[PDB]
C-alpha cells in the first residue's frame, strides 16, 4: 500500500514523506529534482527499512506528463494521493511573467485536477482511500501582491470542498480533504520571488515549520474533517468542515 506525494523534494511534501516513513508507510515520491528525491529515499530507508520507496522525476506542469505519471502507477495499490506540488508568485498582475504564471496554473490547478479526477475515478468505492489537496490560507482569503496564486488556491479549496461533499453525499469510501497552511518555513517564498535567502526567522513573525505542517497534514488524514486550516491570527491548526457556500 502506497502514499503518493507530489512535490516531495522539499518543504511540506518532504517532511510528510519522512513522517509517513516513521509510520511504516511505503511511498511514491514525485518531483523534478531527482537528487533530493534520492537523498530523501536514503533517509526513508534508515527510518523505516521495510518501506518501499518509488521515485518519479516528473515535471507536472505538463498535462501529458501527469497522465503518464498516474497510468504508470496503475499496478500499485495506492491508499493515499497527496497533491502537494505547487508554486507561488509575488507581483502585481500588471507585472507578471505570463510564462511563469501559465506554468503555475498548469501545476497548481491542472496537475492537481488531473490526479484528483483519476484517483477519484478508480478509488471512490475502495475502502481506506484518502485524497489530500494542498491549498493555502491564501485559498480562503485574498492576499495583496499574490492575486493570481491566491486564485489557484481558491480553485483548489473550492474543488476539494465540492469533491469532498460530493463523495460524502454519494456514500463513497474515498475521503477527500484539503490542507490550508499559513506561513510555513520552506523554499516556497524563495521560488516565488525567484531569488534565494528569504529568512522566516527574521522576516516572518508567525510561521510553522515544515515538520509541524507534516504533522497537521497527518492529523487531517486521521480525522473526519474536510478542511485542515491554520488560523491567520492565532496560527492554531483547526480541523473543521467546509468554508464555502454549498448549494446542497
Residues annotated within the binding site are: 7, 9-10, 12, 32-33, 59-60, 84, 149, 153, 184, 186-187, 191
Q: How far is the CB of 214 from a second copy (least distance, A)?
A: 25
Our CB check for ligand NAP shows the closer of 126 and 151 to be 151
Sole binder of ligand NAP in the list 69, 87, 217, 225 (CB under 6 A): 87
Residue 181 touches ligand NAP, criterion: CB under 6 A: yes
Our CB check for a second copy shows the closer of 82 and 163 to be 163
The DSSP annotation for 94-130 comes to GG--HHHHHHHHIIIIIIHHHHHHHHHHHHTTSTT-E
Long-range pairs for 233-236: beta carbons < 8 A, 24 or more residues apart: 235/182, 235/206, 235/207, 235/208
Q: How far is the CB of 39 from a second copy (least distance, A)?
A: 33
Our CB check for ligand NAP shows the closer of 172 and 176 to be 176
Our CB check for a second copy shows the closer of 55 and 143 to be 143
Neighbours of 168 (CB within 10 A): 13
- What does 92 interact with, of a second copy, ligand NAP, none (CB < 5 to 8 A by kind)? a second copy
Sole binder of ligand NAP in the list 78, 186, 221, 237 (CB under 6 A): 186
Residue of minimal CB distance from ligand NAP? 11
Q: Going by C-beta distance under 8 Å and a sequence separation of 6 or more, which residues neighbour residue 48?
A: 21, 22, 23, 24, 25
- Binding to ligand NAP (CB under 6 A) within 3-62 occurs at 6-13, 31-33, 58-61
| 3-state secondary structure (DSSP) of residue 39 | helix
Q: Going by C-beta distance under 8 Å and a sequence separation of 6 or more, which residues neighbour residue 60?
A: 6, 30, 66, 69, 85, 106, 107, 111
d(CA 243, CA 248): 14
Do 181 and 230 form a contact (C-beta atoms < 8 A)? yes
- What does 86 interact with, of a second copy, ligand NAP, none (CB < 5 to 8 A by kind)? ligand NAP
**Residue listed under C-alpha cell 516565488:** 192
Do 114 and 70 form a contact (C-beta atoms < 8 A)? yes
- What does 55 interact with, of a second copy, ligand NAP, none (CB < 5 to 8 A by kind)? none
Sole binder of ligand NAP in the list 4, 73, 134, 150 (CB under 6 A): 134
Residues at the site binding ligand NAP, with contacts judged by CB under 6 A:
6-13, 31-33, 58-61, 84-88, 107, 134, 136, 181, 183-184, 186-188, 191
Amino acid at each position: 500500500k502506497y502514499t503518493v506525494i507530489t512535490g516531495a523534494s522539499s518543504g511540506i511534501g518532504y517532511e510528510t514523506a519522512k513522517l509517513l516513513a516513521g509510520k511504516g508507510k511505503s511511498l511514491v515520491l514525485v518531483a523534478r529534482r531527482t537528487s533530493e528525491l534520492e537523498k530523501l529515499r536514503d533517509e526513508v530507508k534508515q527510518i523505516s527499512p521495510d518501506s518501499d520507496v518509488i521515485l518519479k522525476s516528473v515535471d507536472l506542469a505538463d498535462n501529458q506528463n501527469v497522465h503518464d505519471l498516474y497510468e504508470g502507477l496503475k499496478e500499485l495499490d495506492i491508499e493515499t494521493l497527496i497533491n502537494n506540488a505547487g508554486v507561488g508568485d509575488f507581483d502585481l498582475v500588471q507585472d507578471i511573467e505570463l510564462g511563469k504564471i501559465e506554468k503555475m496554473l498548469r501545476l497548481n490547478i491542472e496537475a492537481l485536477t488531473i490526479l484528483s479526477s483519476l484517483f477519484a475515478r478508480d478509488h471512490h468505492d475502495i475502502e481506506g482511500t484518502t485524497l489530500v489537496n494542498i491549498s493555502s490560507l491564501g485559498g480562503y482569503m485574498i492576499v495583496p501582491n499574490a492575486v493570481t496564486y491566491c486564485a489557484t488556491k481558491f480553485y483548489v479549496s473550492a474543488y476539494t470542498e465540492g469533491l469532498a461533499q460530493e463523495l460524502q453525499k454519494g456514500g463513497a469510501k474515498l475521503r477527500a480533504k484539503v490542507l490550508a497552511p499559513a506561513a510555513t518555513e520552506t523554499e516556497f517564498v524563495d521560488r516565488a520571488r525567484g531569488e534565494a535567502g528569504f529568512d522566516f526567522s527574521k522576516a516572518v513573525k508567525k510561521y510553522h515549520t515544515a515538520a509541524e505542517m507534516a504533522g497537521f497534514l497527518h492529523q487531517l488524514i486521521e480525522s473526519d474533517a474536510i478542511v485542515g486550516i491554520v488560523d491567520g491570527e492565532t496560527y492554531e491548526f483547526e480541523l473543521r468542515g467546509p468554508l464555502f457556500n454549498y448549494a446542497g
